[PDB]
Scaffold this active site. Structure first.
Site, PDB file in Angstrom:
ATOM      1  N   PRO A   1       0.900  -1.300   0.054  1.00 26.21           N
ATOM      2  CA  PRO A   1       0.117  -0.166   0.128  1.00 26.21           C
ATOM      3  C   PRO A   1       0.745   1.257  -0.006  1.00 26.21           C
ATOM      4  O   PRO A   1       1.970   1.348   0.544  1.00 26.21           O
ATOM      5  CB  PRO A   1      -0.758  -0.109   1.475  1.00 26.21           C
ATOM      6  N   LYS A  32      -1.392  -6.768   5.119  1.00 29.41           N
ATOM      7  CA  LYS A  32      -0.196  -6.457   4.277  1.00 29.41           C
ATOM      8  C   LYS A  32       0.925  -6.490   5.150  1.00 29.41           C
ATOM      9  O   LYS A  32       0.748  -5.935   6.029  1.00 29.41           O
ATOM     10  CB  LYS A  32      -0.517  -5.338   3.359  1.00 29.41           C
ATOM     11  N   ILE A  64      -2.824  -3.069  -4.181  1.00 28.26           N
ATOM     12  CA  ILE A  64      -3.632  -4.207  -4.955  1.00 28.26           C
ATOM     13  C   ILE A  64      -4.493  -4.857  -3.825  1.00 28.26           C
ATOM     14  O   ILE A  64      -3.986  -5.736  -2.946  1.00 28.26           O
ATOM     15  CB  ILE A  64      -2.498  -4.882  -5.388  1.00 28.26           C
TER      16      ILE A  64
END
Lengths: 118, 117, 118
Positions: A1, A32, A64
């Site tokens: 991110p 993440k 993503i």
């Protein structure tokens, strides 16, 4: 991110550990790794909201995935809370946009994410 | 709507009321309330266009709707006009990108716009 | 193309010709004219990556076209290479996002690109 935080509050009011807290919060909320999270802080910016120069934060979050309808409610709650605690902003002065990127549109480590995966 | 204006012109050339005029113009052109428009101005930036430091303004507009093909012609005319009047830029030195966001992708007031509407 | 490069490296470390080299490289890689490429450099920024202030570059590239899956592999290689040569960044400290815009979503020369073309 990749996270961009822009505020008209002075740099003084954005604590030194803000990027680190935001990194931890999003690592947990988005599942993440910290090693893939970038945070940019722009403070002391010329920003109006509703045509007034009241304190405001404008935040952009690119990732993503991990940005479903339900996910984004959670991320918004957590990011807004951090802004309330550390920057003393009201909730209606925290504006966040989320960009859910296709892996063909992200370069990292010298190639696209799409070209590095199965 | 969230608007970002970046220019290599000095802050001196961007008048104090520019943000306010842009807010009014977009409230009218997009039929949105002034109270939901944010404007960020970055002036004095390190920007090239055609690989040299000729005056330029690069503008990003993010909005939930009000960004149809026809709408964007109108917004572009009005934003470009303001840049001509207030920054003295030629129209070929005003570059605007529009991002039409889904309401699940905007957080405001502690939740998403989708979840509040 | 509209290109934004943000780094926590000081302005001193981003050479004066960086924007010019990036313009030439992308004109060639993207088959676009230099006269339609803008590059913004933000140096000396407050950026963390992996929750540390190690040197990093975060780059955004917006264009109408020239951003296919194959194109983006090439662009990523070339941009990463320039960052390695000129900024001495490792390739895992160069992060690029690509936005492939519809011509109805770009204003230029006082109208949209869509409204100005065949």
């Amino acid at each position: 991110p990749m996270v961009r935080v822009a505020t008209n509050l002075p740099d003084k009011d954005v604590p030194a550990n803000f990027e680190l807290r935001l990194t931890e919060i999003l690592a947990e909320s988005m599942n993440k790794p910290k090693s893939r999270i970038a945070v940019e802080i722009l403070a002391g910016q010329r920003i109006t909201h509703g045509a007034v120069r009241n304190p405001v934060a404008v935040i952009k979050v690119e990732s993503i995935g991990s940005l479903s309808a339900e996910d984004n409610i959670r991320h918004t709650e957590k990011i807004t809370q951090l802004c309330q605690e550390e920057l003393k902003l009201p909730k209606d002065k925290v504006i966040i946009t989320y960009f859910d990127l296709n892996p063909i549109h992200v370069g990292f480590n010298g190639t696209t994410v799409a070209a590095a995966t199965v």
